[PDB]
Amino acid sequence: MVLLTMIARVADGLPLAASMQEDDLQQYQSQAKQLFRKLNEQSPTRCTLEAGAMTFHYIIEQGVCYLVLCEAAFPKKLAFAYLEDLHSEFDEQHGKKVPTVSRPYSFIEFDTFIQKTKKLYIDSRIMVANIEEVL
Amino acid sequence: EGLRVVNLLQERNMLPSTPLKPPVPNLHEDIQKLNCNPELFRCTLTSIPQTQALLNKAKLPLGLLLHPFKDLVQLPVVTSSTIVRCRSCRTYINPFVSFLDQRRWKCNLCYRVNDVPEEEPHRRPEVQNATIEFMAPSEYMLRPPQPPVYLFVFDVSHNAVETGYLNSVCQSLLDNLDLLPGNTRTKIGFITFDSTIHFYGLQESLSQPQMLIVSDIEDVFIPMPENLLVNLNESKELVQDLLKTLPQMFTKTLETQSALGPALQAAFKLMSPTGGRMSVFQTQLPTLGVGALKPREEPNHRSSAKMTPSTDFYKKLALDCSGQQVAVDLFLLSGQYSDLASLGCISRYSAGSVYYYPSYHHQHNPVQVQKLQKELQRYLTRKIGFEAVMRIRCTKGLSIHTFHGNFFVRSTDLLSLPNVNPDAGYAVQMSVEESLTDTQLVSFQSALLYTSSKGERRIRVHTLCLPVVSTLNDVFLGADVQAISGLLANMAVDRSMTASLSDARDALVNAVIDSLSAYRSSVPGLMVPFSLRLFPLFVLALLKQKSFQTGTNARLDERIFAMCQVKNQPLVYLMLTTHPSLYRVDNLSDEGALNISDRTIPQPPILQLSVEKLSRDGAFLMDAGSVLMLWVGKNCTQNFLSQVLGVQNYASIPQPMTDLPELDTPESARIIAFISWLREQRPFFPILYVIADESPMKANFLQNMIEDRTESALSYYEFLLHIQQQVNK
Amino acid sequence: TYLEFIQQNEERDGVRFSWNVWPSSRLEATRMVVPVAALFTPLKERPDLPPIQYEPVLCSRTTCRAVLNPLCQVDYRAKLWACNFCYQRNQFPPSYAGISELNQPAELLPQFSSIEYVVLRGPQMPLIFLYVVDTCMEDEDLQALKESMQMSLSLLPPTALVGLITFGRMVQVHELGCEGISKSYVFRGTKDLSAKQLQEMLGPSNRFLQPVQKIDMNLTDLLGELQRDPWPVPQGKRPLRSSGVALSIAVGLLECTFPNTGARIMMFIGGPATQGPGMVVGDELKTPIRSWHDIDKDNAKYVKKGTKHFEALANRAATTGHVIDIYACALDQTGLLEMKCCPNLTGGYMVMGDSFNTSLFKQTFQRVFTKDMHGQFKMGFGGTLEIKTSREIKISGAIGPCVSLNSKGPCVSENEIGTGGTCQWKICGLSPTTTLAIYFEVVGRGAIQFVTQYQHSSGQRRIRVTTIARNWADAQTQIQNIAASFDQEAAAILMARLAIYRAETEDVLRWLDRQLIRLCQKFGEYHKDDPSSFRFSETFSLYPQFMFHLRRSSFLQVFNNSPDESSYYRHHFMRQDLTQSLIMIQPILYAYSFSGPPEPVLLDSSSILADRILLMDTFFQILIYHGETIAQWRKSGYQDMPEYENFRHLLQAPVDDAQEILHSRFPMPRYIDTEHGGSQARFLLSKVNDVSLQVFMDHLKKLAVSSA
Ligand SMILES: [Zn+2]
Ligand SMILES: [Zn+2]
């Protein structure tokens, strides 16, 4: 029922696209940048991470991590279902160009698709671990 | 050139006929060739005093004038995966570094040796260009690159409707809707306000744009979580329909009170989550709600120097907008006193800019209509940077202690620039905290980190190197009279608010007295060095500019806006306004620059600002930077009236003549060529007005004759006589 | 005969008295077990009623001012009439100078004891309908509400003014008629606003209340594309719905624009108010909305302050003269308990359902706008009911949809009952079915005059005058003459309204029991200490059975119902006439079998024959029960066979005998088709049967023959 979305290249943690709306974000995106650095070729394929009252869901495909942040009370099953909608569209449009870029947020214009498919979520109409362990 | 000494009472014709060039610092040939462009970054003293004692003896201010975001012709951009910085002070790698071990470079600012990374290092683009732009890595941003957001806030009170400004503003937005800087992520929004706040929803789902009115003035809020700041590209058609509608929605309104304060609080709440550029259009004194301002009696010519805001509201609000990366640009189109001394704070501390159109009216004032037209064109189409930050570093021993310009200074002298516009000029005062005994060169480097309209984090860097001298004469030999006048103009504005207008004027006069008195005590008449031969002239021009004049008919908002221009315009346009260029344009010659292939562009001699240079037999053009006035003599030639003006006699020239006609005469083909050469040297298109004849109620051309006398200001020769009496006391 | 008397006086005067012969002595007047009271319907329709376009004759005594009526003594020779209330002699008006004996004024004919006048003097004000729409509901329920809204707009007279207020988290006051911009005023649904404030913040017809004849095109496009409240509802939480603030702005808008004229504030809600003043429940789904169980244990801290907010608006609306409807359709409760005062103090409607997207609501809603044979609505506005009585009669008070005007007089009794201390009441909304309960007190014949001034839906200002008279009890046969005039049906309902009024503003059954025993001890025949000897006359024998069903009904035993259902049931009972009220207390039961035509049976489980088809009529639902062998040969699919067509006459006789009244009753009753073993047969088993009527009667007779 609230938001934080990030897409990063798993190899070096290079950000690709993100979506953030406030009206906090300082501490919560900092640990998303910390997890993006800890991911490697050995990381779990799909995982769920709990930060006390909040909750992380991420998937990794084609060396691209699709992380979402959200408080704990949100249905985990549907959170992955939306990251499936993100990974599919990204792989279609710029999946051919993600091992080529080097600048941060090279696909920041993908943000126009992240907020629209998430309003199709925020509205009604796998591993378990704690984040303080992975970091 | 010349180490020569000038007596300003015998010459009296000391101004050259060629444009003033910034003084080349006395540096080695291989070091000056790499120095940054002087119009981007310059110093009042090209020869830096070695000690603070030496700087105090010269009685001249030490400081920098910079134009960091100016439009460039060629800008090298390096996309290096890493960026090289001195590990102790983070100064960027610059041309004025020295490599020692071919693996170690010696930063020119803090004297700590650093190691170059494994990534001929001396002639990489970062050491061959003082002006350079970088691609910032991910750690140089606190959030994803923000989208470009443009929120326009319109006053639509009864007085605002009468001025008819909304028609041009909406028409200008329509014409330049595809030219606003940005990508597909461009956001746009609209707020109108009278006694209440009106939001506008833009949904492709419904036939019309929605109008949501918030009437709770003492507790504003956002009426809708969406469709207020819309993506311009996907709802382009509905934004266009609203712009075509707004000018006709309040034609018969009777709302006379304006709730500007609450409207800005609502506007701030709207773009608070993202940031962007807020364009505020106000036409009268705000009188309803928070930020209400009391009326004030306007001065007259008999009132002595006798400035400050009435409330801190618009300052506190600007500081809130700064923290959310919101810059507020204030367009004041008022016909009566609006207390700009308080409203202007909304732009000063949000790194915006103030635009003023005194007594704007769509029919009665054709000058302001065409000035708003061209100023909106530049405003809406010029490049822009968002959530920007600027820091200025100098070599150890030099300390910045005062900043000038539209921004907010934070801890460790960090300049917050919510927006950075390419027409903003900044100034800095510095002193010698510790003597520069060991060093012969010093450097000044400004770094401008911003988010471009395309969503990529950029760092624009300028580096300036200067020599260090240890005698009084060498400090004078490297003085930049224009940069000194500019820094002095900014200091006087702060003094006028800290103390009064008379104190600011005394400080401007004393700056010439004390400086030349110190020079006289270092060497019968008024003797000045060659670098300061124009110092009394320009300071006299400062004291007759609209910012600091006395026995004038100037009003409060006029003077305040003149000071806003002093604190925000680059130096080059402060000089053109303060001391305009004067040319005879009734007989132009082939002595110019017939080099641009098929264009002459004559080079008439620059005349001094005295009516004694005029003549009733010709027509002369004056370049005041923002406007070009062509005074035509009553007894002008028959050739000039018909071949360049298209008129058979002096009495048939139209009273409001907005431009010269492009007649087919080599005289008209002439005069259109030199005017076209001056205009493309500038950002805001300067309109030209040739309606100034004998008595067309437009004779402000004569007040720019700052060397003549009046019953309220000294002439130039009297000013020199006044100075000499104090240098030899 | 005294039964023909009851029916003929209810049809002519719209009045049903508990006693039609009144006590002539102070001892019997105070020893009156059931009070002398009347079920009075002010605007009861009539087959042969002619509008009388002239000002009503008024007694020329400053205090009296009674209307000329068929009980006055007239002298056609002296052009003089004597008032029957104060005996003041009055000169006939110059307009009556030529009235004759052969041709009398209609006001003096006994057939026109109830008469209506038309006062045409001032410019008529149009009707006003302010829609207050909740947008916190699924699009299926929102679009269905939108559809039935545009239907109501199609029925309104063109001159009628309409406004639209949508709300959810915020509340929007729409200014219709705007071009190219469609503007509205948005307010925080968390702060209550006074009428003076709303007038300042907003700036015959207004910008917000416009003639539907010139803005219905703009409204049908706004209403057509009204969408759900845009604010996201987080998981596990209710929508933020500001129903209390939305109402106070709807009230405040009409208070400062069209006060003292007819107008309906129609609020459509799809859930409880979860924010601002009027809050009913918090916004967390894990804590349920208050139940009667929660109310008793004080586990409901919102209902007390939530009620005070809405009864503040109710008294503000009733003082201004406006009526408030509530159309609540939601799967859960909605807050009728706290909001009931708004349609109760005014004459407003209360409609309840599971969803606006049901045939039940959509037909219930279009029943609001039924017209007569002149094409004009069956609603009246701004009613002022003044009652004048003889020197003996004093008014205790009124139970029903009204508000006291607090006008003191010599006919005002000190013993107040319900809305008392006055002889004038304001009824902001009434239909031909609105029924008040006025309670009297005695301190030849006695006369009472009901004068109802109201605004007709056509804009005419009308005055309905009803003058009745009942014989004083001749003292040589005092208790006997009074006993024969007892109206057991009216008394039971009049006593029911007393019990409900005390319960809804609190033991009630103890008072109901003691009055039943006292009535048995005064008007029953028996020897002491022999319960087998107790008998009631034909005038009283049905009263105990009515009390038996009353003390077990959902009106007094509120558990097993949600607090909103109890308010809904009591709302409709305090307004209905005698016929429908008896149906509420004691449902009517008809039987359908091969052995004879349909016929009424007793409400007892000895009538739930397997062989029969039952037709139960509770006022709120129409049920058709199918017995054991009945459900069996229906499940056999044997109706479709052609040689049993008497078959089809049986299973569709109650269905046909249901549709004719399933369309006349304003709150369309729920329809049921259940059999034995079905889960919906519970409604029949619970209304059927201390323990039972047999056991109840034995205990009543055991106590009626013992100590008084
Ligand atoms: Zn360094
Ligand atoms: Zn009388």
Author numbering:
A (entry chain C): 1 to 23, 29 to 130, 148 to 157
B (entry chain B): 346 to 464, 476 to 662, 666 to 882, 888 to 1093
C (entry chain A): 3 to 205, 225 to 464, 475 to 537, 541 to 723, 746 to 764
Share the article's original sentences.
The packaging of cargo transmembrane proteins into COPII-coated vesicles entails a direct interaction between COPII protein and cytoplasmically-oriented ER export signals.
A series of ΦC-signal peptides was synthesized, based on a core sequence of yeast Emp24p, and individual peptides were soaked at high concentrations into two crystal forms of human COPII protein: one comprising Sec23a/Sec24a•Sec22b, the other Sec24c. (D) Schematic diagram shows the bonding arrangement to the potent ΦC motif Leu-Val. The label N denotes the serine residue upstream of the Leu-Val motif. Thus, specific recognition of the ΦC motif involves the terminal carboxylate group bonding to Arg750 and Arg752 of Sec24a, with the penultimate hydrophobic residue of the motif nestling against Tyr496, and the terminal hydrophobic residue fitting to a pocket of hydrophobic side chains.
